[PDB]
Every structure is written in C-alpha cells, then in structure tokens.
C-alpha cells in the first residue's frame, strides 16, 4: 500500500530568508521503497497550506523559502512511493522568520 506518516518534524535553523526543517522516516513503507517526500507550510493565523518543493526530496532536510519577514509558520511532511502518497505527518511547532540574536 502507501507509506506511513513521517515523524518528529523539527526546525534545525531559522532565518528571515529561509527556514531549514528535518524529519525522521516513517515506520512502514507499505511494501514498496520510498521514492521521496513533499513538504508543506502554513501561516499560523491562517488555514492555507502550500506545497514547498516541486520534486520529491530523497533525504531528511529541506530549506523553505518564499517567506514574509516576521510571520510565523507551521510545517508538515508527506512520504511517497509507486503506490501513492501517504498521510501527512503531525504538524511541527510554530517557527518565525527572523534572524537570530
């Protein structure tokens, strides 16, 4: 079948121009090897989800761009294989687009 949801979506680094996020791979691939992942972002006061990357990324890190300085976002990740796209991960903690210090 399709894969399981990825786990533990965390923020590695936050900046006003980009936010780097990571995740762990789902506990079940459903019989087919995983082909990649799709990352989605959402502004905290809104319910608008948008896909961040055009093609699936193979590994556990991704830099998100297209942000507005000062706004906060939450993120989710979806795994995919030849059978299809699985359920998304649990949403991450909110992260603000601001330079450190």
Residue numbers in the entry: 508 to 608
Provide text from the study.
Obscurin, or its homolog obscurin-like-1, bridges the giant ruler titin and the myosin crosslinker myomesin at the M-band. Myomesin is a 185 kDa modular protein that localizes exclusively at the M-band, where anti-parallel dimers cross link myosin filaments. In addition to a mechanical role, myomesin is also needed for the integration of obscurin and its smaller obscurin-like-1 homolog at the M-band (Fukuzawa et al., 2008). Yeast two-hybrid and biochemical analyses have mapped the obscurin/obscurin-like-1:myomesin interaction to the linker region (L) located between the fourth and fifth Fn-III domains of myomesin (My4 and My5, respectively) and the third Ig domain of either obscurin or obscurin-like-1 (O3 and OL3, respectively) (inset) (Fukuzawa et al., 2008).
The ability of OL3:My4L to transition from the solution conformation to that observed crystallographically suggests that the LH helix might have a degree of flexibility. We explored this by solving the crystal structure of My4LH (myomesin residues 510–618) in two different space groups (data collection and refinement statistics in Table 1). In space group P65 (2.05 Å resolution), all four My4LH independent molecules in the a.u. display clear electron density until residue A608, while residues E609-S618 (LH) cannot be modeled. The same applies for four of six My4LH independent molecules in the alternative P21 space group (2.80 Å resolution). However, in the latter crystal structure, crystal contacts stabilize the C-terminal region in the remaining two other My4LH molecules. While in one molecule, LH folds into an α-helix as in the My4L:OL3 complex, in the other molecule the C-terminus is in a more extended conformation. Overall, SAXS and crystallographic analyses support a model in which interdomain freedom allows the transition from a relatively compact solution conformation to an open one that can be stabilized by homodimerization.
